[PDB]
Amino acid sequence: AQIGPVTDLHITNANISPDGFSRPAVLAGGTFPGPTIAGNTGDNFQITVFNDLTDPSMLTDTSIHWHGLFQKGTNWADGPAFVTQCPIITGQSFDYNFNVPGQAGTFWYHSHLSTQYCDGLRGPFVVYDPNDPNASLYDVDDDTTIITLADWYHTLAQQEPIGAAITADATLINGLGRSFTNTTASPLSVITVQSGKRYRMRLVSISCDPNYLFSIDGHDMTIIEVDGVNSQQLTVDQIQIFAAQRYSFVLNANQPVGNYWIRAQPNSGGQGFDGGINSAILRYEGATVEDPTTTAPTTFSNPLVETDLHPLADLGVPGQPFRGGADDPLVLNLAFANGRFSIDGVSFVPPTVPVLLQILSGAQNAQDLLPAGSVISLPSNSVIEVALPAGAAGGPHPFHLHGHNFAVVQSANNATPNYVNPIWRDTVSIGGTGDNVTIRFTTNNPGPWFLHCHIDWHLEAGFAIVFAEDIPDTASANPVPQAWSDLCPAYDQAHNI
Ligand SMILES: *[C@@H]1O[C@H](CO)[C@@H](O[C@@H]2O[C@H](CO)[C@@H](O)[C@H](O)[C@H]2NC(C)=O)[C@H](O)[C@H]1NC(C)=O
Ligand SMILES: *[C@@H]1O[C@H](CO)[C@@H](O[C@@H]2O[C@H](CO)[C@@H](O)[C@H](O)[C@H]2NC(C)=O)[C@H](O)[C@H]1NC(C)=O
Ligand SMILES: [Cu+2]
Ligand SMILES: [Cu+2]
Ligand SMILES: [Cu+2]
Ligand SMILES: [Cu+2]
């Protein structure tokens, strides 16, 4: 069952063994992944999060972010710890009460305190459209068509030793998969289809780090949505999906009744499919209950290339059709050294007072805001351009902007900008050395919006900045409930701050 749009959500510790190895975890709704939160476009979500965490090895505080939802007028509900709230302490609850006007598509929810989402607090979040312009392209779209891709670690997130390399121990597809080392034949996930029907598969990366090469033996995939944005139909046989991205694709169950490998190849950790790692099973009704015997091609025929995507709607691009053709053109210097990332020479360290609270308390320029140099003001009602040139170690880095989606004016591995019809999305690979991935948006959403690499280990190591969008209007635009005002006093009392 899907839950929502008005629902309780309990956060707990428990042991799980998704790849056969037992470890404690941080769970929403008692499961990994968490339950799908869903509603319809424009609905009021009220998600009352109960923090019932008792195991300090994975932190007993928490904060949840509703990834890709714009939160206009509810910046207080966005989730990122010390940007928009103080964390919820154990034994307390908090009602994330917000609305989703003008959005429909595939999203997700995750802890946004430290690297706690790696420990398990990650789930899908779907906003259906009763008048979906893509409705007629498929027959089935429900909880059974959601496909999550997750990295899973046997070492707890807080206990990753500083100075050693971090790689995962299993790829989990719909919460199951097999360990890269000491592989056991634990259960694989099964996605069931009926011969002749068409399915809106909602492909969600809930990854803390690796990108996946996703494919389904014998099948192709027709992409119709990119991070919440309806796309023209694009048929591909493989999708490279970066951390926090979503695609919907039409799967036509048009192959012979049988079993077909679903493949998700991470860019780090175990390479290949030996022992059934990196795999799930696509099973047609009436097939024998047995593993697929299919194989991948040596080379895929039609891999997704981001420049091939275009919006279904005539979304265009704001500003002028050249570099710097914006009201506020920015170029970020994105760097890594000595274990820390930095943006324009500053490494993000979360402040003691959340940025939003600072602004509501009367700090009214970005140079008054802490951390110093990590908060950049944006002017209201203006076209913003942000070039994100790559080269920092640990790439390719998927950059994500809260409160907004954006036109991808230039994509990875292609020096040509597109000022006519590029895809809009909310998380984008900035590519490789020499690249100049560039985004554009307009500022019609007052508040502090986080911008950061979505590799959670990089965010923890400082690869972030806060855009304080329309500081003058932030208080008037984002009235705050008493419960929100109560968070920082309660958090600060519980931690003796
Ligand atoms: C990425 O594109 C940006 C513009 O969006 C480039 O910014 C220019 O940088 C040069 C210095 O290299 C300055 O003289 C200009 O003021 C910048 N803005 C312009 C021309 O609009 C940036 O160099 C590009 N970076 C890479 C690595 O290609
Ligand atoms: C590199 O990116 C550019 C810009 O997004 C792509 O160029 C466009 O190509 C399409 C399809 O051929 C044409 O309809 C557009 O007119 C082009 N726009 C521009 C601004 O050139 C290009 O195809 C990409 N390269 C590859 C190899 O995919
Ligand atoms: Cu996210
Ligand atoms: Cu987000
Ligand atoms: Cu990164
Ligand atoms: Cu974030």
Side-chain angles (χ1 to χ4, degrees):
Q2 306 190 323
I3 57 173
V6 179
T7 196
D8 290 350
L9 187 76
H10 288 261
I11 314 305
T12 59
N13 294 124
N15 298 309
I16 55 169
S17 125
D19 62 350
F21 183 89
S22 185
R23 52 159 282 177
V26 171
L27 305 177
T31 61
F32 183 82
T36 303
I37 297 162
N40 294 322
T41 185
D43 275 354
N44 173 39
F45 284 81
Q46 297 203 212
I47 312 140
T48 300
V49 175
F50 287 79
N51 178 354
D52 299 323
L53 294 169
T54 57
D55 188 338
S57 66
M58 306 172 275
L59 312 181
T60 69
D61 306 304
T62 198
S63 198
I64 304 189
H65 171 56
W66 323 97
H67 182 115
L69 295 310
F70 303 149
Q71 301 289 353
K72 183 171 174 162
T74 55
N75 177 266
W76 64 265
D78 185 55
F82 310 105
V83 177
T84 61
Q85 62 176 98
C86 289
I88 305 157
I89 67 175
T90 190
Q92 299 200 346
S93 57
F94 184 71
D95 185 2
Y96 290 90
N97 180 2
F98 61 88
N99 301 287
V100 307
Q103 295 192 269
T106 313
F107 304 97
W108 67 293
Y109 68 88
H110 56 86
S111 177
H112 212 309
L113 178 60
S114 179
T115 49
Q116 190 184 60
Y117 95 75
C118 310
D119 290 332
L121 205 183
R122 346 178 188 167
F125 185 112
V126 180
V127 182
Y128 294 103
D129 187 348
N131 299 131
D132 203 310
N134 286 323
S136 74
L137 298 183
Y138 50 84
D139 305 296
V140 181
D141 174 25
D142 60 29
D143 225 32
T144 77
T145 66
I146 293 169
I147 306 178
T148 56
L149 309 180
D151 47 342
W152 190 255
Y153 299 83
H154 295 173
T155 301
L156 265 50
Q158 302 298 316
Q159 299 177 348
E160 291 288 5
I162 326 137
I166 299 174
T167 58
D169 300 293
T171 297
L172 307 179
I173 297 165
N174 292 350
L176 300 173
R178 298 178 176 159
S179 63
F180 303 143
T181 65
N182 186 221
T183 304
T184 57
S186 55
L188 302 181
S189 289
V190 179
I191 291 172
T192 302
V193 293
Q194 182 188 334
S195 190
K197 289 184 139 130
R198 312 149 282 193
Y199 294 78
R200 180 182 187 150
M201 301 294 186
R202 298 172 180 263
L203 184 63
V204 185
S205 167
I206 61 177
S207 186
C208 263
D209 174 358
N211 66 73
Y212 298 91
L213 296 177
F214 183 86
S215 56
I216 303 171
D217 284 355
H219 293 73
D220 56 8
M221 302 175 282
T222 303
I223 295 170
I224 63 165
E225 184 213 330
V226 186
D227 305 357
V229 179
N230 293 337
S231 67
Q232 294 170 355
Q233 293 173 62
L234 183 72
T235 299
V236 292
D237 61 346
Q238 185 181 60
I239 293 164
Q240 186 170 31
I241 185 169
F242 299 84
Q245 297 184 329
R246 290 86 65 206
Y247 289 101
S248 289
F249 64 91
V250 180
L251 183 65
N252 305 101
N254 66 359
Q255 301 300 299
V257 172
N259 296 288
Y260 300 79
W261 288 121
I262 301 175
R263 304 178 180 282
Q265 174 57 79
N267 62 312
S268 56
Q271 297 304 301
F273 305 90
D274 286 349
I277 67 168
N278 297 324
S279 313
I281 296 166
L282 181 83
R283 183 162 287 141
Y284 283 61
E285 284 183 15
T288 313
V289 178
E290 52 180 19
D291 288 352
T293 63
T294 54
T295 63
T298 54
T299 309
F300 287 81
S301 289
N302 297 287
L304 172 57
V305 174
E306 188 177 71
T307 53
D308 290 341
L309 298 164
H310 306 285
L312 185 64
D314 177 8
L315 298 185
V317 179
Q320 298 163 285
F322 46 89
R323 303 188 192 282
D327 298 312
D328 185 8
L330 304 171
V331 182
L332 301 190
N333 178 345
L334 303 174
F336 176 81
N338 297 326
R340 299 281 312 165
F341 286 97
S342 58
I343 300 192
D344 291 338
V346 181
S347 191
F348 194 78
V349 179
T352 299
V353 186
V355 183
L356 177 65
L357 188 55
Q358 296 178 50
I359 297 168
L360 297 193
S361 299
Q364 282 216 14
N365 76 306
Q367 295 103 304
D368 286 359
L369 292 174
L370 301 181
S374 287
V375 190
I376 301 301
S377 70
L378 301 177
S380 67
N381 301 311
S382 297
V383 180
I384 313 307
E385 179 175 83
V386 195
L388 299 174
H397 295 282
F399 267 72
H400 167 61
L401 183 60
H402 291 220
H404 283 284
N405 60 16
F406 47 74
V408 183
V409 303
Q410 183 164 324
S411 293
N413 206 45
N414 184 337
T416 304
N418 181 357
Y419 304 105
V420 188
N421 69 349
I423 197 55
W424 285 59
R425 74 185 314 152
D426 69 37
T427 303
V428 66
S429 177
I430 69 175
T433 313
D435 284 342
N436 205 12
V437 165
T438 297
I439 71 171
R440 277 185 186 183
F441 60 96
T442 309
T443 49
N444 297 299
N445 191 5
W449 305 114
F450 219 3
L451 168 78
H452 65 82
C453 181
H454 218 296
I455 291 163
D456 217 31
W457 316 110
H458 299 180
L459 170 58
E460 185 76 355
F463 213 13
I465 207 159
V466 173
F467 285 137
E469 173 169 342
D470 190 3
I471 292 177
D473 301 320
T474 293
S476 72
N478 297 284
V480 299
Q482 191 59 56
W484 177 87
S485 301
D486 287 345
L487 291 170
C488 286
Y491 180 87
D492 290 343
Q493 180 253 278
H495 293 281
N496 198 26
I497 292 148

